[PDB]
Design a protein around this ligand. Structure first.
Ligand SMILES: O=C1NS(=O)(=O)c2ccccc21
Ligand SMILES: [Zn+2]
Length: 258
């Protein structure tokens, strides 16, 4: 039927409705650290999030997302491998049922407990619908989560998840500052890829940060209490909403750091 992460509608099935699933620049990938190429021409990232305006938090049946006002250049990503200005639209997570899985990208086949995606779109295309039709339309900042100490900047998100437990629920979520989710270092890997969910469009420049953030076991446990199902349907816990690594094919992963 409609796509998801179960036995009968999971990532192995998606190609029947979205044939680009078997395409040439699909994501995620496994980032072999010994094969990645250091590119000294790569610039530092510029992350300008001080004027970010968060709007809502929503359970969309596949993850939960926080949306931002992208009507002007308030929260933007520039630099790195990018040409031009990319506006922050939303962030969301992918996570596991157990601490040793949940990330989409892997590093030397190591999985992390979760992965944060900050989705941005290229303002030269005017709106995000147009941007997803272009090979340089989106830039996604990917951040790994490991279980350790708590991340205080994540706690405002954890505490509202009760209010959006089931598919289709949303809540007001204003004045959230996404700078509290960033690691110390902005060293990164980058490669050309795709959305990791349908429609799997090949429109993404991936920027995957080397340094994970730490979250506590209690914080991640709250992800795992969300539901895939709508209210009044049989309860299915929202866990393991990650797509496995795809073949690299004719791509090179570049590193900003030696
Ligand atoms: O689920 C997703 N992972 S992603 O960052 O590739 C992305 C981009 C746009 C819409 C959804 C999604
Ligand atoms: Zn994602």
């Amino acid at each position: 039927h409609h796509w998801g992460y179960g036995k009968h509608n999971g990532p192995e099935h998606w190609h029947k409705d979205f044939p680009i699933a078997k395409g040439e620049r699909q994501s995620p990938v496994d980032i072999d650290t010994h094969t990645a190429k250091y590119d000294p021409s790569l610039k530092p990232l510029s992350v300008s999030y001080d004027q970010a305006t968060s709007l809502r938090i929503l359970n969309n049946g596949h993850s939960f997302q926080v949306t931002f006002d992208d009507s002007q250049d308030k929260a933007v990503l520039k630099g790195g491998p990018l040409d031009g200005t990319y506006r922050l639209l939303q962030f969301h997570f992918h996570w596991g049922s157990l601490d040793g899985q949940g990330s989409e990208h892997t590093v030397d086949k190591k999985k992390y407990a979760a992965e944060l995606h900050l989705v941005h779109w290229n303002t030269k295309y005017g709106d995000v619908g147009k941007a997803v039709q272009q090979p340089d339309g989106l830039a996604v900042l990917g951040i790994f989560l490991k279980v350790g100490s708590a991340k205080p900047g994540l706690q405002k998100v954890v505490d509202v998840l009760d209010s959006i437990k089931t598919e289709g629920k949303s809540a007001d979520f204003t004045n959230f500052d996404p700078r509290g989710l960033l690691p110390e270092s902005l060293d990164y890997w980058t490669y050309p890829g795709s959305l990791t969910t349908p429609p799997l469009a090949e429109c993404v420049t991936w920027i995957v940060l080397k340094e994970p953030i730490s979250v506590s076991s209690e914080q991640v446990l709250k992800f795992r209490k969300l539901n895939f199902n709508g209210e009044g349907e049989p309860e299915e816990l929202m866990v393991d909403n990650w797509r496995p690594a795809q073949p690299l094919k004719n791509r090179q992963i570049k590193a900003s750091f030696k």
